[PDB]
């Protein structure tokens with residue numbers, strides 16, 4: 001590994017007022033394979049995750065990250081702790097997004113919350129979110145928080161202009177935010193790392209490396225046999241090495 | 253003093269395909285006035301040029317153009333070599349890509365201006381990477397050859413279509429050449445490639461032999477062996493060096509059609525061969541097409557077998573058509589398929605040897621940029637047999653984890669980055685550990701390299717073995733001078749020994765014949781399984797190796813461990829030994845420990861006649877045994893061989909070698925102790941101390957039993973053939 005797990009970062013105050021924007025430094029994004037318009041997967045305390053877009057900053061420190069009070073409260077952390085950043089280069093657009101406001105933020109106001117709050121907040125914005133993000137929407141001389149309920153890309157997605165926004169009546173309240181349904185990943189795969197690393201290599205080298213197999217001349221993993229007792233996460237492994245790599249799965 | 257060595261000189265003719273040589277050097281090297289030659293240069297660059305006789309040319313010197321000099325990576329004053337090469341023939345497809353620095357200012361079609369008048373009825377031979385200059389339009393254009401389909405040996409024919417896609421060559425590893433041909437591409441089976449070249453080369457280029465031969469000597473040749481050593485590699489290599497229609501078909505594609513079309517594309521395939529005059533038509537995994545009759549459940553497969561039989565019978569001498577085929581085993585296919593007249597000469601391929609594995613590794617590392625820190629010779633020594641596809645996967649996996657060891661690039665890669673393939677000893681060792689022996693269960697056919705080293709004794713016994721085995725190999729006419737039938741069966745007995753196996757390997761090395769060792773536990777496994785047909789396969793593989801040395805060890809162990817003399821393998825051994833040719837020098841050598849329990853039919857005169865007791869090894873001749881110990885931990889000097897010749901009086905040979913390696917293990921553990929002390933502070937001392945040898949002497953006793961050696965003396969007294 002490397003020194004002190006260098007994806008660990010210090011939370012700091014930001015300059016941008018955007019909720020879904022966190023700030024890094026120039027050689028940090030180059031070392032972490034990050035672009036100026038790409039999306040990441042932030043992870044923090046209390047097993048709470050976040051999806052954000054890393055933008056370039058000049059006043060940001062080398063080993064710190066600048067973010068506002070929304071992601072700090074979403075990660076359930078205060079000023080002075082440590083957070084981690086993971087790259088998320090395989091995000092797909094969303095199809096249906098359910099949002100429900102908190103009860104104290106809509107007391108005194110009535111009507112449709114889509115055309116006033118949700119439509120200007122996502123008008124060609126492409127802000128990425130996860131399941132359980134409470135994001136602050138400004139409008140009507142007030143500040144109303146809106147919480148993600150359920151998306152059809154269930155772990156993580158980007159709000160497309162074709163995404164139907166669901167803001168039906170009788171919303172839920174602030175709760176323990178229990179998890180009930182998700183899509184699999186490498187963390188969903190259990191203890192197989194002595195062979196998971198091998199098959200990770202034999203599928204990662206096919207990923208975005210056409211000329212590398214020309215340098216070999218032949219492609220080494222032509223056919224892969226995965227054998228064991230019936231039910232050892234087999235289609236879980238096959239589905240896991242597909243979505244995070246980024247491909248078409250098409251199981252038969 | 254190897255007169256192929258020539259001196260480069262300036263040419264007389266301005267052609268890039270004509271070299272000038274003297275008249276007395278053309279007749280000495282057996283070349284015509286338009287013969288094609290193999291001109292080797294530097295940076296492994298080679299070219300073919302038509303030799304013309306010149307009166308002003310020197311004998312030692314050859315005259316060639318600046319184009320040929322720059323293509324051969326030589327300057328004025330270097331040396332080249334020449335080989336007679338008459339099998340250079342016409343080409344099918346030629347792809348050319350011009351070099352980017354010489355194509356500025358000209359636009360349009362360059363095929364009818366440059367490519368067409370340059371090759372108009374000139375028969376110019378070229379190679380891969382050849383840069384030849386073409387003039388026209390008050391300019392001069394360099395053209396680099398990408399790929400021709402007879403890649404090592406081609407001549408540009410007027411019927412060859414020239415692929416002239418106008419584009420500069422990209423500065424990456426994206427060349428358009430892919431899977432062309434090669435006798436440089438076939439790895440390690442020269443001793444059978446010469447045989448199959450002898451069978452199928454006579455259909456090539458000579459239709460005039462049919463009057464003398466009456467019936468064509470090939471009609472079909474099977475190519476059987478373990479999977480992974482190139483059926484289609486051999487068949488594609490023998491294709492397009494001759495120049496014919498290859499037309500590979502595979503048995504799964506034949507069986508993949510439905511009813512009514514599985515019958516189709518078989519007469520259609522053979523008629524589509526019959527539109528062309530020659531045929532090297534090859535079927536892939538034909539054992540799936542034609543299994544055993546009892547293995548067939550349905551009858552559609554039997555219909556396909558019947559269709560193949562009708563096509564093979566009806567295609568009798570129909571204008572020199574040959575069908576190539578491959579399978580796994582001779583008994584795996586239908587025995588009705590081996591009708592004499594067609595598919596007759598089932599030649600063997602087998603596993604490659606260590607030299608064959610070495611040249612497989614060399615050929616598969618030719619294209620990729622080796623870092624040259626490795627020498628790759630000893631990599632074939634640690635393996636105990638890995639097949640050519642396994643070695644291709646070995647090279648691919650080693651390069652893959654070598655690229656994986658270094659970090660990824662900035663984004664998404666240049667060729668110089670791809671030229672930095674710094675493969676090490678540990679990289680190939682890691683790839684060797686991360687592999688599998690897919691063909692280890694197969695018997696390994698190879699020549700050994702013992703070369704008279706382990707045994708410093710048995711003075712007249714080795715003379716008897718030499719005159720019995722080696723002397724018929726060099727000259728068997730002396731046995732027909734006076735009427736001698738050689739007794740191929742010999743038996744070695746006494747205390748247990750691998751030195752007799754080393755003696756058999758030394759005999760097979762002196763004869764330079766392939767050696768096959770039949771394991772005693774393998775015979776025991778065939779005895780408990782009662783699979784007596786496997787030794788028929790053993791003897792069928794044995795008779796294909798001519799000559800061969802067949803070794804059997806511990807034949808008394810079958811009668812000793814019989815608990816289910818008389819045994820199922822033993823009568824089969826007697827039956828197969830009776831069914832042997834008196835020629836071919838397929839000598840049987842036997843090893844055993846207890847001669848009292850033995851088959852009494854095998855001690856009868858006839859097949860096994862000479863019975864030789866092998867005694868204890870010489871304590872006075874332990875210099876050769878410690879010479880064998882001078883490899884695999886060479887002991888340093890200031891040691892006494894007389895120290896191991898003082899108290900050692902009845903100790904076994906391999907016991908002495910393993911106790912020397914145990915003293916070596918003491919040296920390795922004290923070197924590990926020295927490294928531990930050196931790392932604990934913050935040379936391995938390769939010399940071996942006398943205390944290791946003293947503790948080796950105190951921890952080794954003989955395996956010699958007194959009752960055993962007096963019963964061996966009783967066997968010698970029973971078979972007492974002594975001079976009075």
Ligand SMILES: Nc1ncnc2c1ncn2[C@@H]1O[C@H](COP(=O)(O)OP(=O)(O)O)[C@@H](O)[C@H]1O
Pocket residue numbers: 188189190191230231232233234235236
């Ligand atoms: N190694 C594993 N780790 C986590 N969950 C597993 C594992 N193996 C099986 N499962 C669970 O079993 C269910 C079916 O998986 P599995 O039986 O492996 O499918 P298949 O047999 O088709 O490969 C999934 O819902 C998954 O949650």
Ligand SMILES: Nc1ncnc2c1ncn2[C@@H]1O[C@H](COP(=O)(O)OP(=O)(O)O)[C@@H](O)[C@H]1O
Pocket residue numbers: 437438439475476477478479480481482483484485578579601602612640641644
């Ligand atoms: N040096 C090599 N380069 C590329 N492929 C090879 C090489 N040696 C063997 N092969 C592969 O091995 C495969 C199987 O051939 P095989 O069945 O072993 O032939 P055989 O009839 O001699 O048993 C072929 O498809 C061929 O592609």
Ligand SMILES: Nc1ncnc2c1ncn2[C@@H]1O[C@H](COP(=O)(O)OP(=O)(O)O)[C@@H](O)[C@H]1O
Pocket residue numbers: 706745746747748749750751752865866867868869904905906907
């Ligand atoms: N007839 C014999 N009597 C004593 N020693 C022998 C005899 N033949 C060979 N030797 C030596 O004794 C050694 C013992 O070989 P070993 O490997 O123990 O036999 P095996 O191969 O049957 O296990 C051999 O290396 C050889 O140098």
